[PDB]
Amino acid sequence: GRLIYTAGGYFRQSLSYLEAYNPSNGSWLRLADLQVPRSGLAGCVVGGLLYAVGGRNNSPDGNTDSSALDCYNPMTNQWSPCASMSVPRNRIGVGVIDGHIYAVGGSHGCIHHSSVERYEPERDEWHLVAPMLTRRIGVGVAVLNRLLYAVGGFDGTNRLNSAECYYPERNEWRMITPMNTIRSGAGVCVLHNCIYAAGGYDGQDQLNSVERYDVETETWTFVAPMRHHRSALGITVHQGKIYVLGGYDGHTFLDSVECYDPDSDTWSEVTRMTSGRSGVGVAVTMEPC
Ligand SMILES: CCCC[C@H]1CCCN1C(=O)[C@H]1CCC[C@@H](c2cccc(-n3ncc(C(=O)O)c3C3CC3)c2)C1
């Protein structure tokens, strides 16, 4: 598309911001607020519609895990509730295959989900698919060659380097090569034939390391690290370059936005969000009106 949308997040409380960044002119642009604050959500795009999935409203007067699926139309600049998932999912992963949205893992209270469900925008309906072999909250999700990948996260006791892959036609999950670094709450995306895992939390500190999985070779290879350690960062791809947005570096909620150029293997600070925050949902689509 054209704009990088960031929705929700957390700073002192769950947030309702919807701001769009234009990598062509460096401009930010605040849009319609989310009807319900939510952190640990995920963002995705299907047929020009932006979707905010799961999360959790950490607020003074209470904390409520969200099973919501909200939908934003850039032409109207309006949100609209859509069908709700079977189960609340905080610290969630999502991935799009054949116009369908896969909601992966997440937490509801202290229940850590292995379950997975798929949303069909044409029927406004969810349906549960096969669960993951492992419970994963704060899981990174990526789609490559119509295959879904769940990478890292937290399973209730330990934080994981493990990763697994879902083959839709079989409705089946299988382990793939684990990462070289334990990552939970990382930024996972796809670029070319590789699945990048950036930052996260490894049980002790926030990570700035970045590695990528080559499906052909089935191996993880480290790559130039980010300039800031990050956890609960937003991540997306725009014109063959990765953008990581915000996160927590261990002491401050970052407004830093970094951009990875895979041809030069370098990271550079593109801009800075209008305020520091972690746990945002990110996606990319057309400009609004
Ligand atoms: C609710 C307020 C208190 C938490 C604040 C202060 C300390 C820091 N932090 C935040 O940045 C919060 C903000 C809300 C969203 C939070 C979030 C989003 C996505 C994934 C995860 N996630 N999933 C698994 C694990 C794990 O550790 O294994 C994690 C943690 C990031 C490592 C957490 C981050």
UniProtKB/Swiss-Prot annotation:
Outcome of mutating R91A: Impaired interaction with SQSTM1/p62. Abolished interaction with SQSTM1/p62
Mutagenesis / variant outcome for changing R56M: Impaired interaction with NFE2L2/NRF2
Outcome, altering R159A: Does not affect interaction with SQSTM1/p62. Abolished interaction with SQSTM1/p62
Record's comment on post-translational modification: Non-enzymatic covalent modifications of reactive cysteines by electrophile metabolites inactivate the BCR(KEAP1) complex. Accumulation of fumarate promotes the formation of cysteine S-succination (S-(2-succinyl)cysteine), leading to inactivate the BCR(KEAP1) complex and promote NFE2L2/NRF2 nuclear accumulation and activation. Nitric oxide-dependent 8-Nitro-cGMP formation promotes cysteine guanylation (S-cGMP-cysteine), leading to NFE2L2/NRF2 nuclear accumulation and activation. Degraded via a proteasomal-independent process during selective autophagy: interaction with phosphorylated SQSTM1/p62 sequesters KEAP1 in inclusion bodies, leading to its degradation.
Record annotation: effect of changing Q206A: Impaired interaction with SQSTM1/p62
Phenotype on disruption: Early postnatal lethality caused by abnormal cornification. Mice survive until weaning and probably die from malnutrition resulting from hyperkeratosis in the esophagus and forestomach that cause gastric obstruction. Defects are caused by constitutive activation Nfe2l2/Nrf2, leading to constitutive expression of phase 2 detoxifying enzymes. Mice lacking both Nfe2l2/Nrf2 and Keap1 reverse the hyperkeratosis phenotype and are healthy and viable in normal conditions.
Subcellular localization(s) per the UniProt record: Cytoplasm; Nucleus
Modified residues (S-cGMP-cysteine): C110
Modified residues (S-(2-succinyl)cysteine): C289
Ranges occupied by Kelch repeats: 3-48, 49-99, 100-146, 147-193, 195-240, 241-287
Record site: Sensor for electrophilic agents: C110
Function: Substrate-specific adapter of a BCR (BTB-CUL3-RBX1) E3 ubiquitin ligase complex that regulates the response to oxidative stress by targeting NFE2L2/NRF2 for ubiquitination. KEAP1 acts as a key sensor of oxidative and electrophilic stress: in normal conditions, the BCR(KEAP1) complex mediates ubiquitination and degradation of NFE2L2/NRF2, a transcription factor regulating expression of many cytoprotective genes.
Family per similarity comment: Belongs to the KEAP1 family.
Domain notes from UniProt: The Kelch repeats mediate interaction with NFE2L2/NRF2, BPTF and PGAM5. KEAP1 contains reactive cysteine residues that act as sensors for endogenously produced and exogenously encountered small molecules, which react with sulfhydryl groups and modify the cysteine sensors, leading to impair ability of the BCR(KEAP1) complex to ubiquitinate target proteins.
Quaternary structure note: Component of the BCR(KEAP1) E3 ubiquitin ligase complex, at least composed of 2 molecules of CUL3, 2 molecules of KEAP1, and RBX1. Interacts with NFE2L2/NRF2; the interaction is direct. Forms a ternary complex with NFE2L2/NRF2 and PGAM5. Interacts with (phosphorylated) SQSTM1/p62; the interaction is direct and inactivates the BCR(KEAP1) complex by sequestering it in inclusion bodies, promoting its degradation. Interacts with NFE2L1. Interacts with BPTF and PTMA. Interacts with MAP1LC3B. Interacts indirectly with ENC1. Interacts with SESN1 and SESN2. Interacts with HSP90AA1 and HSP90AB1.
Protein name as annotated: Kelch-like ECH-associated protein 1
